[PDB]
């Protein structure tokens, strides 16, 4: 159960997850007699094979896909702020002012 | 010069004297059974290898 008062803080955020990616995993299902040998042996990260366990939090240090999203999120802030001040509306009309001159 | 036949006279005809191609090839094979076999007008053949 989710108290709807808590949802509107979720259902209003500008940032929402994509939530379709598990289907983009390399399908592995076959005769699984050899899906256990890979445990006692060191073979489940061999030849591009990789196990996937979904998580909730990542290591913030050295994760170049984490930091790369921050400097994208931290840019969405500087932009979003510049809508509140009312300037993106000024330069979107600075072009048209320079677009209708002739 | 389109007069030169754009379907060869050697090709087995449509066998449909109605005026339209009878099943095209589909049906010459059904009627070639009637050729490789025996026609309907066929009377007493002479040879000694006879049907019955």
């Amino acid at each position: 159960e989710i108290p709807e008062a808590a949802r509107t803080v979720m259902r209003s955020h500008p940032l929402q997850p994509q939530l379709g990616f598990v289907h983009a995993l390399p399908t592995d299902n076959r005769d699984a007699v050899v899906q256990e040998w890979e445990r006692m042996h060191h073979l489940d990260w061999q030849f591009g094979k990789a196990v996937y366990e979904p998580r909730s939090a990542e290591n913030e240090r050295g994760n170049l896909t984490w930091l790369r999203e921050v400097r994208h999120h931290e840019a969405r802030e500087a932009f979003q702020a510049d809508v509140d001040s009312g300037e993106a509306r000024r330069r979107h009309m600075a072009k048209i002012k320079a677009a209708a001159q002739v | 010069d389109a007069a030169w036949y754009e379907i060869p006279t050697q090709f087995h005809t449509h066998t449909y004297a109605d005026g339209t191609p009878q099943s095209r090839s589909a049906s010459l094979a059904k009627a070639t059974k009637y050729i490789h076999g025996m026609p309907h007008n066929m009377g007493q053949l002479y040879s000694y290898h006879r049907p019955y």
Binding site: L15, Q18, A24, L25, G48, A50, R55, S56, T65, W66 | -
Partner: protein, 59 residues
């Protein structure tokens, strides 16, 4: 992750940033391997998640 690579693909990694870019930079016919699919379809889904765990926090 132990993929087999040439004497040269050991150097294409450093100048490219690691094992993630060196896979996603090349594309199919460029990265002729078939291990470059078992593992690329893993980085992609592992990066698509990393940007979900992130919004999971800004949420």
């Amino acid at each position: 992750v132990q993929v087999p690579m040439v004497e040269a693909a050991m150097f294409e990694i450093e100048k490219d940033g690691g094992f993630d870019n060196f896979i996603l930079k090349r594309s199919g016919p460029e990265l002729r391997s078939t291990y470059g699919e078992r593992i690329r379809r893993h980085l992609l889904v592992r990066q698509k998640e990393t940007q979900k765990n992130f919004v999971l926090d800004q949420q």
